[PDB]
Design an enzyme around this catalytic site. Structure first.
Site, PDB file in Angstrom:
ATOM      1  N   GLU A 149       0.805  -1.218   0.000  1.00  0.00           N
ATOM      2  CA  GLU A 149       0.000   0.000   0.000  1.00  0.00           C
ATOM      3  C   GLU A 149       0.841   1.273   0.000  1.00  0.00           C
ATOM      4  OE1 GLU A 149      -2.523  -0.570   3.392  1.00  0.00           O
ATOM      5  OE2 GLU A 149      -3.845  -1.965   2.324  1.00  0.00           O
ATOM      6  N   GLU A 271      -4.416  -9.034  -0.316  1.00  0.00           N
ATOM      7  CA  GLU A 271      -5.138  -8.902   0.955  1.00  0.00           C
ATOM      8  C   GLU A 271      -6.638  -8.715   0.744  1.00  0.00           C
ATOM      9  OE1 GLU A 271      -3.700  -5.810   3.481  1.00  0.00           O
ATOM     10  OE2 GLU A 271      -1.622  -6.485   3.470  1.00  0.00           O
TER      11      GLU A 271
END
Ligand SMILES: OC[C@H]1O[C@@H](O)[C@H](O)[C@@H](O)[C@@H]1O
Ligand SMILES: [Mg+2]
Length: 339
Positions: A149, A271
């Site tokens: 991220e 994820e």
């Protein structure tokens, strides 16, 4: 032709993240970082349990920041690298598919400021050079994921794909990652390298600006805890799943098909998951709609698992690591038996 990547991925049933473990940022420059967020030191047994249940792929998130020497070498402390190898080796001993990443570097040096492109590209490459060297002899079931991220923490568009300038920076950082690993040679010449979007965001403007490398042995990682208000706890969130919001998953997934899958680009959800809100039957129904959507085109996913279920925090826990028993077998069944 990128079909080599599809073949490797097709062997995955479904994945599992060793969350809040080697990604944990306590303990400073010490192996104790692993246990700093309340999880027990990882063992072969723990990985076996995950594998035996049906999660034959495992993502190993790792935060290196506090274990790095000074610039420009950013030498990874020998003790830490050794430990990361031990934990990877657990999965290798079980012939599992593996993702190794860099994780909460975003808390430290990985701040996506376009004016700082050089220092960002160079640190990323310096770290991955050392990792690639360490795992040079590891087979094709070990995959690398460059960043987790990547974003500017606290910026307005942190969780909405950042700015167009930042999205160019992410493309540069993706090339740096790939470039650094390939230059180590060995099995890293054709190892599957997983790139990502800004913040692993999957919105249309985010995907549109994503530059695709010509390297045929790569994949695009996204994070899709979709819908956010079902999966997370916040103002406006809910714990009921009747299928009325399935359109959110499908609508998002159509964009992923539009920009990646239907162009023959391999995609992996590194994820996802839903926090436990005393709603076992609802999560099971969400899994059917969410994972079944991915299965339409054989896209694989890795479930986030931080070992939090009873206590306070985001309740993404599935495996009780201290007891080697699962917190919720009904939810876990839905995952492992998704096909
Ligand atoms: O990128 C996936 C994510 O979705 C965001 O909306 C959340 O705020 C983050 O905590 C999470 O990591
Ligand atoms: Mg070779």
């Amino acid at each position: 032709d990128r079909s080599r990547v599809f073949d490797i991925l097709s062997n995955i049933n479904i994945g599992w993240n060793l969350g809040n473990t080697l990604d944990a940022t306590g303990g400073g420059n010490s192996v104790n970082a692993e246990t700093s967020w309340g999880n027990p030191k990882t063992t072969q047994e723990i990985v076996d349990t995950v594998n035996d249940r049906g999660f034959n792929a495992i993502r190993i998130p790792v935060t290196f920041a506090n274990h790095l020497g000074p610039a420009p070498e950013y030498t990874i402390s020998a003790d830490w690298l050794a430990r990361v190898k031990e934990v990877v080796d657990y999965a290798v001993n079980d012939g599992m598919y593996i993702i190794l990443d860099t994780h909460h570097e975003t808390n430290y040096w990985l701040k996506t400021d376009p004016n700082n492109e050089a220092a960002l590209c160079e640190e990323l490459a310096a770290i991955w050079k050392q990792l690639a060297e360490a795992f040079k002899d590891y087979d094709e079931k070990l995959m690398f994921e460059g960043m987790n991220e990547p974003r500017m923490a606290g910026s307005a568009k942190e969780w909405s794909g950042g700015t167009p300038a930042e999205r160019k920076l992410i493309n540069a950082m993706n090339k740096a990652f790939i470039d650094a690993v390939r230059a180590t040679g060995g099995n890293n010449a054709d190892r599957v390298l997983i790139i990502c979007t800004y913040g692993h965001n999957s919105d249309e403007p985010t995907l549109k600006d994503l530059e695709i490398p010509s390297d045929p042995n790569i994949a695009v990682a996204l994070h899709t805890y979709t819908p956010y208000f079902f999966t997370y706890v916040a103002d406006g969130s809910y714990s009921v799943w009747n299928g009325s919001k399935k359109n959110d998953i499908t609508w998002q997934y159509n964009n992923i098909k539009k920009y990646l899958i239907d162009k023959g680009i391999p995609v992996v959800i590194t994820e996802t998951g839903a926090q436990f809100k005393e709603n076992t039957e609802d999560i099971v129904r969400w899994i059917g709609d969410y994972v079944g959507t991915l299965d339409q085109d054989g896209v694989k996913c890795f479930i986030w698992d931080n070992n939090i279920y009873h206590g306070n925090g985001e309740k993404f826990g599935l495996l009780n690591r201290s007891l080697l028993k699962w917190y919720n077998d009904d939810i876990v069944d839905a995952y492992v038996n998704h096909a």
